[PDB]
Amino acid sequence: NSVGSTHNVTILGSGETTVVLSHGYGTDQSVWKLFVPHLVDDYRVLLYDNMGAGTTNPDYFDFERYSSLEGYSYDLIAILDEFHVSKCIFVGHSMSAMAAAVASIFRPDLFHKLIMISPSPRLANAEDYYGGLEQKEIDEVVGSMEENYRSMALGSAPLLLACDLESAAVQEYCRTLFNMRPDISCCMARMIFGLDLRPYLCHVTVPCHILQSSNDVMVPVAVVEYLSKNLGGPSVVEVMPTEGHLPHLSAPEVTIPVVLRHIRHDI
């Protein structure tokens, strides 16, 4: 089976330039359903599911491979090569944006620019670094998701999204979160909370467009300022007038025009 097939790769639209849409944790490629209609007329849109999404087969989830971000970077490279991609416009959420940043160190030929929605190089606090969460809180969260996965997913969704419980956004996010096998989901969460890309930002040279919500519980604004300062190539930060950690999901009316502008215009 090709890597594209096992990741449910979808090609929509048509064009000389490829826009790659890469969902983040707890979602699948359906997270982009309201964005796609705005892209298909002008671009070849490539979407795929990260290994471990509920739409993927657990037989392909190698717990060791996906306990480090490079497993996701390598899958991205393999999929883009299977589709003969050169210099794509990549759009990712959070750690899928960081997986592309890592991939671009290995394979800058694949990326014209990275559009990164709510990214962080390190979610955990460290000495002289405020990432957002103490290691002990991360331990509690990961322990809670082992205890009652679905209870924790529902309890966290409104806070992560900055949306009310009864909203379409919370309903959609819980649908995909609950679709993941709990052990796979915990493995991915542990990887995400343990990632520290701070030493490697200076090696990223592709242009990076950082799209930040106005209030993200997972990403303090100083973290995106730190990310932009330390990236090795061109970068820009745009703070959008909507809250939460998944603004593409919760507020497409704000986030779609911003994403389109960053797709259409280089730094």
Automatic annotation (TrEMBL):
Q: Please name the Pfam families in this protein's record.
A: Abhydrolase_6
Give all residue intervals belonging to the AB hydrolase-1 domain.
19-255
Q: Which UniProt keywords apply?
A: Hydrolase
Please indicate if the UniProt record lists Hydrolase as a keyword: yes
Show the GO MF annotations. Answer: hydrolase activity
InterPro entries annotated for this entry? AB_hydrolase_1, AB_hydrolase_fold
- Please indicate if the UniProt record lists Glycoprotein as a keyword: no
Q: What domain of life does the UniProt record list for this protein's source?
A: Eukaryota
Q: Matching PANTHER family, A to Z?
A: ESTERASE-RELATED
Regarding protein family, the annotation reads: Belongs to the AB hydrolase superfamily.
**What protein name applies here?**
Hyposensitive to light 8
